[PDB]
Design an enzyme around this catalytic site. Structure first.
Site, PDB file in Angstrom:
ATOM      1  N   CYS A   1      41.226  69.421  20.598  1.00  0.00           N
ATOM      2  CA  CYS A   1      41.220  70.584  19.723  1.00  0.00           C
ATOM      3  C   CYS A   1      40.490  71.828  20.214  1.00  0.00           C
ATOM      4  CB  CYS A   1      40.687  70.255  18.323  1.00  0.00           C
ATOM      5  SG  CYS A   1      39.266  69.155  18.260  1.00  0.00           S
TER       6      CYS A   1
ATOM      7  N   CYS B   1      66.437  80.594  -9.537  1.00  0.00           N
ATOM      8  CA  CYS B   1      67.564  80.112 -10.328  1.00  0.00           C
ATOM      9  C   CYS B   1      67.518  80.288 -11.848  1.00  0.00           C
ATOM     10  CB  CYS B   1      67.810  78.614 -10.089  1.00  0.00           C
ATOM     11  SG  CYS B   1      66.327  77.567 -10.129  1.00  0.00           S
TER      12      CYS B   1
END
Length: 568
Positions: free
Chosen positions: A223, A506
């Site tokens: 990392c 929607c």
């Protein structure tokens, strides 16, 4: 172990709840007790020639477990890299945990990959996070670059929303040999703390594990310091391999073992908690991914009721899919439903008005696409007293495409308030909308608008697509019209130079909205990666806005559209 025995799956959720109880106290005591109980040396990390090869003076490599490079004779310390072997469960030295390479150690890192015969590299960080360098780029932008004895050739890049995959060819000094190495960079870890949901990381992990050959050397993982996110990746993976054979989990045991192999593996308590969450989610959510040419067969399987089971495979799979800043006593008019609300870490923030506290709220949630984050905005169908905020929302977020997924009225009931003008100009608060053109297509209507800011006078083009062919009740029998509608919206996005999110709604903005974003994602992954995992796709969407893809019928239609699209 005696004090901390294995946690069997099916007793895991109650174990995590016991750990979480009263401000994560038991977890805190568990994590603070982690001790391999031994004394180690780090003489090599301390050699004065090696001191500057450490990104962090306080993150060193234990002698007994360090990765030993072949010495460049004449050069002291040339056998040193800040890296350690780390076990998997039943897997000796399965991983190499290492720091993010430094400009001076680029060649050492690539030589490690070579001499260790590694084939996969896992990078758990962005190069820069919050303007702080976490890692220096140790690979070429394009073509070939030499680092010490190793020529590294970038062959390909595949850059998705949460992670990027790069393929490399390695050629060493003279040596006729050529090695392939695949590089997986997870780019969605937050700048502070851990990910809110483990779902995207878990998908990253699967990708890594399906593309790592099974006769290769240790997976190289790093990392920044190579202890914190690196440690999470290693434990998650090892424990996933553990439940495959034992159906039990021993996070406590494995981390303790890791600490005997590298200092600080799993650096924070938050990381330790995250590890558990990622593993809990994983046990109840099994394999749902299917290769392209097995989709029909797999769909044919879900469409059936298994002997001794009550409902179809499609139905059970769907069943397995189951903020406060929004629910303030003032927003009891801004929502269509008080049970369908946006999450905090995703909700679209509206630039607040000078003296109206509580008007920054709009029922809209940021949604990541296949290739980029925040590619969509999932919102409710506007109401009369919501209309103004919707046009507001579009402007401030550079969303120049709206996707409506309902008729204005369905089954003798309104589904959405007509929020756009048809025959005149309409001033919505500090904006005016001009109906410029209107095209009636077979399955949808395209409406062009000219939104002009009444304050600074600036104007933008907003294209609205309304799908008119969703059956009043149920789902389309053919996906063809939907596939194309999905196509047209994205075609329109690019060729008009629209670098902003596509807003989609929607009625509630979850059911058909979920279906739209789902298939937009699924259809592109099918084209490129050649596989289909609609379950995991809905799962991720649900971690960005709740209830996406509301019904079994919507869920099956995603499969229908996928199957048809493969046929084309």
């Amino acid at each position: 172990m005696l004090s901390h025995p294995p946690i069997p799956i099916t007793d895991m959720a109650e174990h995590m709840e016991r750990l979480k109880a009263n401000d994560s106290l038991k977890l805190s005591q568990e994590y603070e007790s982690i001790d391999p109980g031994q004394q180690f040396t780090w003489e090599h990390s301390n050699l004065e020639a090696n001191k500057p090869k450490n990104r962090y003076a306080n993150v060193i490599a234990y002698d007994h477990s360090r990765v030993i490079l072949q010495p460049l004779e004449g050069i002291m310390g040339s056998d040193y890299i800040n890296a350690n072997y780390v076990d998997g469960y039943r897997r000796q030295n399965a991983y190499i945990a290492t720091q993010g390479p430094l400009p001076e150690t680029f060649g050492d890192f690539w030589r490690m990959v070579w001499e260790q015969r590694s084939a996969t590299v896992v990078m758990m960080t962005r190069l820069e996070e919050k303007s702080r360098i976490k890692c220096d780029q140790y690979w070429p932008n394009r073509g070939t670059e030499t680092y010490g004895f190793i020529q590294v050739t970038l062959l390909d890049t595949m850059e998705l929303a949460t992670f990027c995959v790069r393929t490399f060819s390695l050629h060493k000094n003279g040596s006729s040999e050529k090695r392939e190495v695949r590089h997986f960079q997870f780019t969605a870890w937050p700048d502070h703390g851990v990910p809110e949901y483990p779902t995207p990381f878990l998908a990253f992990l699967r990708r890594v594990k399906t593309c790592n050959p099974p006769d290769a050397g240790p997976i190289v993982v790093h990392c920044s310091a190579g202890v914190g996110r690196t440690g999470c990746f290693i434990v998650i993976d090892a424990m996933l391999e553990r439940i495959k054979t034992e159906k039990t989990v021993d996070v406590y045991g494995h981390v303790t073992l890791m600490r005997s192999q590298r200092n600080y593996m799993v650096q924070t308590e938050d990381q330790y908690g995250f590890i558990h969450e990622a593993l809990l989610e994983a046990v109840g959510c099994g394999n749902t991914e299917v290769p392209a040419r097995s989709l029909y067969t797999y769909i044919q399987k879900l469409a059936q009721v298994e002997p001794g089971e009550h409902v179809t495979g499609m139905e059970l799979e769907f069943k397995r899919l189951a903020f406060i800043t929004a629910s303030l006593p003032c927003n009891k008019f801004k929502n269509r439903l008080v049970n369908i609300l946006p999450y905090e870490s995703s909700r679209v923030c509206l630039q607040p008005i000078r003296g109206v506290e509580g008007s920054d709220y709009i029922n809209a949630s940021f949604i990541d696409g296949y290739r980029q984050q925040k590619a969509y905005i999932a919102t409710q169908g506007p109401l009369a007293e919501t209309t103004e905020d919707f046009w507001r929302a579009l402007w401030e977020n550079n969303s120049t495409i709206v996707v409506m997924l309902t008729k204005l009225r369905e089954m003798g009931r309104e589904k959405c308030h007509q929020y756009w003008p048809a025959e005149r100009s309409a001033r919505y608060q500090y904006f005016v909308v001009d109906p410029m053109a209107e095209y009636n297509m077979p399955q949808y209507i395209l409406r062009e608008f000219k939104v002009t800011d009444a304050r600074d006078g600036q104007s933008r083009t907003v294209r609205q697509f309304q799908f008119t062919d969703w059956p009043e009740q149920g789902a389309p029998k053919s996906g063809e019209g939907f596939i194309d509608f999905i196509g047209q919206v994205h075609k329109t996005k690019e060729q008009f130079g629209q670098d902003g999110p596509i807003s989609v709604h929607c009625s509630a903005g979850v059911g058909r909205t979920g279906v739209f974003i789902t298939l937009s994602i699924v259809l592109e992954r099918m084209r490129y990666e050649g596989v289909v995992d609609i379950f995991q796709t809905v799962k991720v969407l649900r971690t960005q806005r709740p209830a996406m893809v509301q019904t079994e019928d919507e869920y099956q239609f995603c499969f229908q559209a996928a199957l048809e699209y493969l046929g084309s």
